[PDB]
Amino acid sequence: GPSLDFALSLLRRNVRQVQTDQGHFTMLGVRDRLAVLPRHSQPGKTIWIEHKLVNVLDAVELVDEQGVNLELTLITLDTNEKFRDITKFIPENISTASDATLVINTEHMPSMFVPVGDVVQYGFLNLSGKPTHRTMMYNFPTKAGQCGGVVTSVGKIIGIHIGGNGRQGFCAGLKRSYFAS
Numbered sequence: 001g002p003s004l005d006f007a008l009s010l011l012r013r014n015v016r017q018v019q020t021d022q023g024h025f026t027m028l029g030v031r032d033r034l035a036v037l038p039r040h041s042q043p044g045k046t047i048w049i050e051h052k053l054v055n056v057l058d059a060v061e062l063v064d065e066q067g068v069n070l071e072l073t074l075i076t077l078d079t080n081e082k083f084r085d086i087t088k089f090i091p092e093n094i095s096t097a098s099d100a101t102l103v104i105n106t107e108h109m110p111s112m113f114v115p116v117g118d119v120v121q122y123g124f125l126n127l128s129g130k131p132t133h134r135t136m137m138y139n140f141p142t143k144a145g146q147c148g149g150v151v152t153s154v155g156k157i158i159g160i161h162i163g164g165n166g167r168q169g170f171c172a173g174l175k176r177s178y179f180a181s
């Protein structure tokens with residue numbers, strides 16, 4: 001219903017099929033020329049968006065006040081395009097949620113809704129030797145190919161998927177101030 005209406009709106013206008021040397025990811029266009037990707041996709045000076053090559057002008061890998069990885073990287077793309085500003089759908093603080101859907105859009109998983117259920121606070125997560133703070137979990141056997149997916153519930157954007165164990169899956173908590181500047 002109104003929750004997925006929003007997911008469609010976001011798929012169409014802000015969620016992009018992307019590739020880096022690290023493989024396939026879902027990119028969230030945030031506003032203007034600013035997008036986010038999970039840190040592990042390691043975007044270089046360039047990146048493929050719907051297969052066309054786009055320059056990356058600047059790239060920040062977000063960290064704690066304590067310097068811990070938050071597993072997110074803001075990029076500023078080289079285009080004449082504005083993403084419709086969806087920062088007003090990102091809460092001020094990392095928000096847990098109920099019947100969330102994970103929105104994925106890559107070449108292999110195009111236009112994809114995954115019903116991950118509730119999203120609960122997790123916090124510290126060490127995936128493959130690499131710590132992350134401010135993560136949240138949903139109880140769903142998430143997989144390779146879904147990183148960068150956008151976690152939504154009730155018209156809010158709360159998360160970018162970043163990992164899983166074959167049973168649960170984990171996202172990077174989104175908060176609006178990250179998209180400040």
Ligand SMILES: *C(=O)[C@H](C[C@@H]1CCCNC1=O)NC(=O)[C@H](Cc1ccc(F)cc1)NC(=O)c1cc(C)on1
Nearest residue numbers: 040127128130142143144146147162163164165166
């Ligand atoms: C997204 O690219 C991908 C998605 C995971 C893969 C594992 C199964 N479930 C999926 O949701 N993420 C990763 O593979 C993640 C990469 C990562 C994330 C954060 C970080 F700090 C460093 C690396 N790796 C894992 O989730 C993972 C799973 C096991 C087992 O070890 N590592």
